[PDB]
Coordinates of C-alpha atoms in Angstrom, one line a residue:
Chain C
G1 CA 71.3 -35.7 30.5
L2 CA 75.0 -35.8 31.4
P3 CA 76.4 -37.6 28.4
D4 CA 76.8 -34.7 26.0
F5 CA 77.7 -34.5 22.4
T6 CA 81.5 -33.9 22.0
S7 CA 83.0 -32.8 18.7
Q8 CA 86.3 -34.2 17.5
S9 CA 87.8 -30.7 17.8
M10 CA 87.0 -30.5 21.5
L11 CA 88.5 -33.9 22.0
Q12 CA 91.7 -32.9 20.3
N13 CA 91.8 -29.7 22.3
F14 CA 91.5 -31.8 25.5
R15 CA 94.1 -34.2 24.1
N16 CA 96.5 -31.2 23.6
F17 CA 95.7 -30.0 27.2
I18 CA 96.7 -33.4 28.6
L19 CA 99.9 -33.4 26.5
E20 CA 101.2 -29.9 27.3
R21 CA 100.4 -30.0 31.0
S22 CA 102.3 -33.3 31.1
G23 CA 105.5 -31.8 29.8
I24 CA 105.5 -32.9 26.1
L25 CA 105.4 -30.4 23.3
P26 CA 102.3 -31.1 21.1
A27 CA 104.5 -30.3 18.0
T28 CA 107.2 -32.9 18.6
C29 CA 105.4 -34.9 15.9
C30 CA 102.8 -37.5 16.9
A31 CA 101.8 -38.2 20.5
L32 CA 98.7 -39.8 22.0
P33 CA 98.0 -40.1 25.7
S34 CA 96.2 -43.5 25.1
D35 CA 99.6 -44.9 24.0
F36 CA 101.1 -44.4 27.5
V37 CA 98.9 -46.8 29.4
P38 CA 99.0 -50.6 30.0
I39 CA 96.5 -53.1 28.6
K40 CA 95.7 -56.0 31.0
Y41 CA 94.9 -55.6 34.7
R42 CA 97.7 -57.9 35.7
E43 CA 100.0 -55.8 33.4
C44 CA 99.3 -52.6 35.2
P45 CA 100.0 -51.2 38.7
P46 CA 96.9 -51.1 41.0
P47 CA 96.7 -47.3 40.8
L48 CA 96.0 -47.1 37.1
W49 CA 93.5 -50.0 37.1
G50 CA 90.6 -47.6 36.6
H51 CA 92.4 -46.4 33.5
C52 CA 92.9 -49.9 32.3
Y53 CA 89.2 -50.6 32.8
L54 CA 88.4 -47.4 30.9
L55 CA 90.6 -48.5 28.0
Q56 CA 89.1 -52.0 27.8
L57 CA 85.6 -50.4 27.9
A58 CA 86.6 -48.0 25.1
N59 CA 87.9 -50.8 22.9
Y60 CA 84.7 -52.8 23.5
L61 CA 82.6 -49.8 22.6
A62 CA 84.7 -49.0 19.6
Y63 CA 84.4 -52.5 18.1
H64 CA 80.8 -52.7 19.2
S65 CA 79.8 -49.5 17.2
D66 CA 81.5 -50.9 14.1
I67 CA 83.8 -47.8 14.2
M68 CA 86.8 -50.2 14.0
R69 CA 76.2 -49.6 13.1
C70 CA 76.3 -52.0 16.2
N71 CA 72.5 -53.0 16.6
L72 CA 71.5 -49.3 16.3
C73 CA 71.5 -49.5 12.5
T74 CA 71.2 -53.0 11.0
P75 CA 67.8 -54.2 12.4
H76 CA 65.4 -51.4 11.6
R77 CA 67.2 -48.1 10.7
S78 CA 68.9 -49.8 7.7
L79 CA 67.0 -49.0 4.5
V80 CA 68.5 -51.9 2.7
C81 CA 67.4 -54.4 5.3
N82 CA 64.0 -52.7 6.0
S83 CA 61.8 -52.8 2.9
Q84 CA 59.1 -50.6 4.4
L85 CA 61.5 -47.8 5.4
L86 CA 63.0 -47.9 1.9
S87 CA 59.6 -47.7 0.2
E88 CA 58.6 -44.9 2.5
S89 CA 61.8 -43.0 1.6
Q90 CA 61.2 -43.4 -2.1
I91 CA 58.0 -41.3 -1.9
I92 CA 59.6 -38.6 0.4
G93 CA 58.9 -35.7 -2.0
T94 CA 56.1 -36.8 -4.3
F95 CA 53.4 -35.8 -1.8
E96 CA 50.5 -33.4 -2.5
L97 CA 47.2 -32.7 -0.8
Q98 CA 45.0 -29.6 -1.1
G99 CA 41.3 -29.8 -0.5
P100 CA 39.8 -26.3 0.0
Chain Y
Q1 CA 74.2 -11.4 -63.6
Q2 CA 74.7 -14.4 -61.4
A3 CA 72.2 -16.3 -59.3
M4 CA 72.5 -18.4 -56.1
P5 CA 69.9 -20.6 -54.6
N6 CA 68.0 -19.5 -51.5
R7 CA 69.2 -20.9 -48.2
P8 CA 67.3 -23.8 -46.6
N9 CA 65.2 -22.9 -43.6
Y10 CA 63.2 -25.5 -41.8
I11 CA 60.4 -24.4 -39.5
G12 CA 58.5 -26.4 -37.0
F13 CA 57.5 -26.8 -33.4
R14 CA 60.0 -26.9 -30.6
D15 CA 61.5 -29.8 -28.6
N16 CA 58.7 -30.9 -26.2
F17 CA 56.5 -28.0 -27.4
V18 CA 58.5 -25.5 -25.5
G19 CA 56.9 -22.1 -25.2
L20 CA 53.4 -23.1 -26.0
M21 CA 52.3 -22.6 -22.4
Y22 CA 52.8 -19.6 -20.0
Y23 CA 54.9 -21.0 -17.2
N24 CA 56.6 -18.4 -15.0
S25 CA 54.6 -15.5 -16.4
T26 CA 53.7 -13.3 -13.5
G27 CA 51.4 -11.1 -15.7
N28 CA 49.6 -14.2 -17.1
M29 CA 49.4 -16.9 -14.5
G30 CA 46.9 -19.6 -13.5
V31 CA 45.0 -20.6 -10.4
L32 CA 43.8 -24.0 -9.2
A33 CA 41.8 -22.5 -6.3
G34 CA 38.4 -23.5 -5.0
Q35 CA 35.2 -21.9 -6.2
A36 CA 35.0 -20.2 -2.8
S37 CA 38.7 -20.1 -1.7
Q38 CA 40.5 -17.3 -3.6
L39 CA 43.9 -18.8 -2.8
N40 CA 45.9 -19.4 -5.9
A41 CA 47.4 -22.9 -5.5
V42 CA 49.7 -22.4 -8.6
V43 CA 52.5 -20.0 -7.5
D44 CA 53.7 -19.4 -11.0
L45 CA 56.6 -17.0 -10.5
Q46 CA 59.9 -16.5 -12.3
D47 CA 62.2 -17.9 -9.6
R48 CA 62.0 -21.4 -11.1
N49 CA 62.5 -22.1 -14.8

């Protein structure tokens, strides 16, 4: 159960932690830690290769999730694509059953 | 002495027969309960209009 929901606010707080501890004022306009990192493995010193792998993984996930649905939404969870789910939704409230 | 005609006054029922029932009347409500249930299935209170 390790992967735990993270709110954008907590991520920004962590982002500010990284920035300050690293000697850059958070208020000197815009600054993102992800901007100070190479891209390709052969474009980075061996040390930060883990970081490069993480960045490639992050880009892959980001484009996979459609964040710019992935396959978590379109096949079944999509009401437009799934007729049965849409029809079930249409009757969400008009239900009634007493039999005493 | 002068005379003026009486003012027109049309009377009829209301739009969608408003008021002819007793919705949201706590004193005078209804029940859709079973012959041997004594549980009023029509919660006719004044919270909803």
